[PDB]
Design an enzyme around this catalytic site. Structure first.
Site, PDB file in Angstrom:
ATOM      1  N   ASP A   1       0.896  -1.162   0.000  1.00 25.86           N
ATOM      2  CA  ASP A   1       0.000   0.000   0.000  1.00 25.86           C
ATOM      3  C   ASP A   1       0.926   1.201   0.000  1.00 25.86           C
ATOM      4  O   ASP A   1       1.406   1.590   1.023  1.00 25.86           O
ATOM      5  CB  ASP A   1      -0.889  -0.035   1.262  1.00 25.86           C
ATOM      6  CG  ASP A   1      -1.766   1.194   1.441  1.00 25.86           C
ATOM      7  OD1 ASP A   1      -1.942   1.951   0.474  1.00 25.86           O
ATOM      8  OD2 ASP A   1      -2.335   1.481   2.538  1.00 25.86           O
TER       9      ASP A   1
ATOM     10  N   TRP B   1       5.649  -3.628   7.662  1.00 26.14           N
ATOM     11  CA  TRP B   1       4.679  -4.713   7.606  1.00 26.14           C
ATOM     12  C   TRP B   1       5.280  -5.821   6.731  1.00 26.14           C
ATOM     13  O   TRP B   1       6.148  -5.577   5.895  1.00 26.14           O
ATOM     14  CB  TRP B   1       3.275  -4.221   7.143  1.00 26.14           C
ATOM     15  CG  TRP B   1       3.175  -3.592   5.754  1.00 26.14           C
ATOM     16  CD1 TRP B   1       2.858  -4.267   4.643  1.00 26.14           C
ATOM     17  CD2 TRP B   1       3.401  -2.200   5.323  1.00 26.14           C
ATOM     18  NE1 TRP B   1       2.865  -3.445   3.552  1.00 26.14           N
ATOM     19  CE2 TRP B   1       3.191  -2.174   3.939  1.00 26.14           C
ATOM     20  CE3 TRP B   1       3.756  -0.991   5.965  1.00 26.14           C
ATOM     21  CZ2 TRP B   1       3.322  -1.017   3.156  1.00 26.14           C
ATOM     22  CZ3 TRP B   1       3.881   0.163   5.189  1.00 26.14           C
ATOM     23  CH2 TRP B   1       3.668   0.135   3.795  1.00 26.14           C
TER      24      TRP B   1
ATOM     25  N   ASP C   1       9.538   1.100   4.478  1.00 25.84           N
ATOM     26  CA  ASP C   1       9.331   2.342   3.760  1.00 25.84           C
ATOM     27  C   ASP C   1      10.627   3.089   3.646  1.00 25.84           C
ATOM     28  O   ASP C   1      11.602   2.807   4.347  1.00 25.84           O
ATOM     29  CB  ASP C   1       8.295   3.222   4.459  1.00 25.84           C
ATOM     30  CG  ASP C   1       6.909   2.685   4.366  1.00 25.84           C
ATOM     31  OD1 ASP C   1       6.596   1.913   3.407  1.00 25.84           O
ATOM     32  OD2 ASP C   1       6.047   3.009   5.211  1.00 25.84           O
TER      33      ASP C   1
ATOM     34  N   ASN D   1      -1.242  -2.931   6.541  1.00 28.20           N
ATOM     35  CA  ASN D   1      -0.658  -1.928   5.628  1.00 28.20           C
ATOM     36  C   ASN D   1      -1.443  -0.615   5.476  1.00 28.20           C
ATOM     37  O   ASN D   1      -1.161   0.149   4.578  1.00 28.20           O
ATOM     38  CB  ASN D   1      -0.298  -2.516   4.250  1.00 28.20           C
ATOM     39  CG  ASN D   1      -1.480  -2.810   3.377  1.00 28.20           C
ATOM     40  OD1 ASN D   1      -2.605  -2.424   3.676  1.00 28.20           O
ATOM     41  ND2 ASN D   1      -1.227  -3.516   2.260  1.00 28.20           N
TER      42      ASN D   1
END
Lengths: 110, 359, 360, 110
Positions: D14, D39, D58, D86
């Site tokens: 996501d 995640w 990220d 997410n």
């Protein structure tokens, strides 16, 4: 009619029409602050055939309204004619300079 | 696998271009997008907060941004700044405080420039009274406020002098400022009237040569400023238009709307038909290629609705930009040749710039 | 003419809705858009910086936002805050400082709530260790973390008690928290397992009644938590699906994907066919309307690709939201009736809420 | 491909694919910082038919990349299974939590 970029008094607007942003042509949306300065346009009123000075004060201190973006340039001039120029932020001298929307205030006959 | 940071831009500097995305719909999140012009690849970006401006250092090593912060974005204390970023790592290095009057406006080149020697950043202020601000790069300090430029607008550096630049004034002339090695005004001069402000206003964007600059007007005339000497000599107009062009009301339009190929003297200008009051920012129907020595057009090509351009001298390239897409042209011959288009380079950009290679 | 500011919202409170626009493509400029649901008119907005969350005070006078600032946005010191805004002037009034761990995520209702008495704001923290944060509205202060909620997620207020709420835990049960008058934990209790986390995970969005809440699962089952007493009693599953439904693999999907019309016991749920692993956030092919007493479907209508909804108990309305557009439904009868659509209410919203009317 | 949302490793992304943002599936774009947390997805490799653990760290501290937005949800679970979830920003514990892009780091067999 007033929310259209082709409304006669919006002839030098570069911004978002405040009338589409919870305000009106002469009032800031709630929680946005008028600019004390502005660029000026001279716009022809097709309805009565006269020309009028319009003052494009901004409303400031809220992030971009995003509605009714216009970019009209009648009689607009570059920054060496500074108060006829619309590629600058007329919120630039406000306590908060974030640009929210543009108003079209009728001053009088040109 | 292990995720790592600390990496440099993947393409050589000579392939890089900088698309200044104002993101006008969300102007507090403006940014610079870095692209490889040879293949359209996105290389990275630099965040520039509210209505950022950008330029690359003349030596190619650093990116300079100019922006405004507030403590709480829409409220709290204002901080106008220049930031120095590493060009290869795309990382923040230094903040330079400015007075709270840096120009907030669309990304004309002339609002945020540097001296030819690269030692001073030269920027436009508006409070709304105008002045030119000088930042000493080595010291990281704002060092001079050129109030003599009141009533003037934008900065045109002189490529034949180390610390000199010009500005366009309300009298229709040019003010030249020569800075000393301390960044303070060392001398200045004012030209005679170049253009009639009322009757034939010029676009501020210069077509800049080593020792002269050309400007185009709202009505398709050309004015020139020769700065081979200490005193600027001005002339014009000559017309971009022949009789046929006039019959169809061709005029210039755009933002960063001109460019000069210095080796040939060719001047590039965005033009559109059916010109009238209010069409000076219209997208290009055509690009015209003008021989500035003979004062005649040599070629015309489709404009692809472009609004802004920039020129790379050493690779003989022109970029054009329609607000979202960047077109890459070869200008090594009089007729430009379109090489590729980079789609979706920005949401709302009026300025693209090459990474400097000339040092 | 003379330009003025200082004006109030032009439509009365009872006409207003709040569309939380994450603006994910430019998430540092998230905002709340205020609309009139009766005519689609844009009324104003509240800026909410990076990934704002929003709720309206129970008494209808103030808008509460939750957001994150940094001194230089992408660098510098972090400030997580709740802001209090005047609802009629849409102006900032007060910043309440939070510890720098407020949840950053999509706008599920349960991440930013208040107690039934309106005296405490109750929010999800993640550092990434989870806890529930409590803000004392009268004092304008952060109280302290509810550390008992570690390994749990989201806030379901108990509408039958002044300052109690529940959260869903990784054991498949619910943790209930009862606050004292100072906003500290006075007592707590943990239910038995309601659902199998492995075999039948539930969506966190409650279909919330006054003394019970229903939850739907990834496979279209319904679980219930009855908090009529101090100890929560849990039950389920019962299936949303009949044989025909099961044959076409209908399952729920969305974000704020369910709603309860309390007076009738009708539960509203976004559903789509051809369910399988990975489809739990798919837009609605349909909205199903379930009678929670009889445990049977009483209506099904086109979903208009909706992802999130909200219900107004006082006007018998449902709003749905597809990310950009808001649909207004009359739900005074078993079959919802579409009244209008507000186009372009947001660029990236997963949450819409009514301005409160009544509710005492 | 790696720049397509359907690439097998991206089954629980996501966010914006970092490989479209000036990085790769395992390197952050210049000037963006890896998150120490993530995640996890379990994604099916269509070549060898085995399932692998993918860690969606990220890259952080720059504003949204905006390219190659994906929203895939294979094996994704709600916040009560927090590290399988997410709909939260995995930059949340970084020195600067602004979300730039998502990586898809191969851990090993599931």
């Amino acid at each position: 009619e007033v929310n259209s970029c082709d409304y006669w008094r919006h002839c030098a607007v570069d911004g978002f029409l405040c009338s589409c942003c919870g305000g009106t042509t002469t009032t800031c949306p709630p929680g946005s602050t008028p600019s004390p300065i502005s660029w000026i346009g001279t716009c022809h009123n097709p309805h009565d055939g006269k020309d009028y000075l319009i003052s494009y004060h901004d409303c400031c201190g809220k992030t971009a309204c995003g509605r009714c973006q216009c970019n009209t340039q009648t009689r607009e001039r570059p920054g060496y004619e500074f108060f006829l120029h619309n590629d600058v932020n007329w919120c630039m001298a406000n306590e908060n300079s974030t640009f929210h929307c543009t108003t079209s205030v009728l001053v009088g006959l040109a | 696998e292990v995720l790592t940071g600390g990496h440099s831009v993947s393409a050589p500097q000579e392939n890089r271009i900088y698309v200044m995305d104002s993101v006008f719909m969300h102007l507090t999140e403006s940014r610079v997008h870095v692209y490889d012009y040879t293949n359209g690849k996105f290389l990275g970006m630099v965040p520039t907060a509210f209505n950022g401006h950008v330029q690359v250092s003349n030596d190619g090593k650093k990116i300079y941004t100019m922006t405004t912060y507030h403590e709480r974005i829409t409220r709290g204390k204002r901080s106008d700044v220049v930031e120095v970023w590493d060009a290869d790592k795309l990382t923040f290095e230094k903040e330079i405080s400015l007075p709270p009057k840096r120009v907030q406006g669309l990304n004309y080149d002339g609002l945020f420039r540097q001296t030819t020697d690269g030692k001073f950043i030269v920027l436009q202020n508006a409070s709304p009274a105008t002045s030119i601000g000088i930042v000493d790069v080595a010291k990281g300090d704002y060092v001079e406020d050129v109030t003599a430029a009141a009533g003037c607008w934008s900065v045109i550096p002189q490529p034949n002098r180390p610390r000199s630049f010009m500005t366009i004034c309300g009298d229709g002339g040019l003010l030249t400022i020569n800075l000393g090695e301390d960044g303070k005004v060392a001398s200045q001069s004012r030209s005679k009237q170049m253009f009639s402000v009322k009757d034939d206003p010029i676009f501020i964007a210069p077509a800049l040569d080593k020792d002269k600059a050309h400007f185009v007007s709202y009505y398709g005339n050309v004015y020139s400023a020769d700065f081979s000497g200490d005193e600027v000599k001005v002339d014009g107009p000559w017309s971009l238009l022949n009789d046929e062009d006039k019959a169809k009301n061709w005029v210039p339009g755009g933002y960063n709307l001109v460019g000069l190929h210095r080796a040939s003297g060719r001047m590039y200008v965005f033009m559109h038909p059916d010109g009238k009051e209010g069409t000076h920012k219209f997208p290009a129907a055509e690009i015209w290629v003008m021989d500035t020595k003979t004062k005649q057009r040599v070629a015309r090509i489709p404009g692809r609705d472009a609004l802004s351009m920039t020129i790379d001298q050493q690779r003989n390239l022109m970029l054009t930009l329609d607000g979202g897409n960047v077109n890459v042209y070869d200008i090594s011959q009089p007729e430009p040749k379109l090489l590729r288009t980079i789609e979706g380079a920005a949401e709302a950009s009026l300025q693209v710039q090459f990474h400097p290679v000339g040092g």
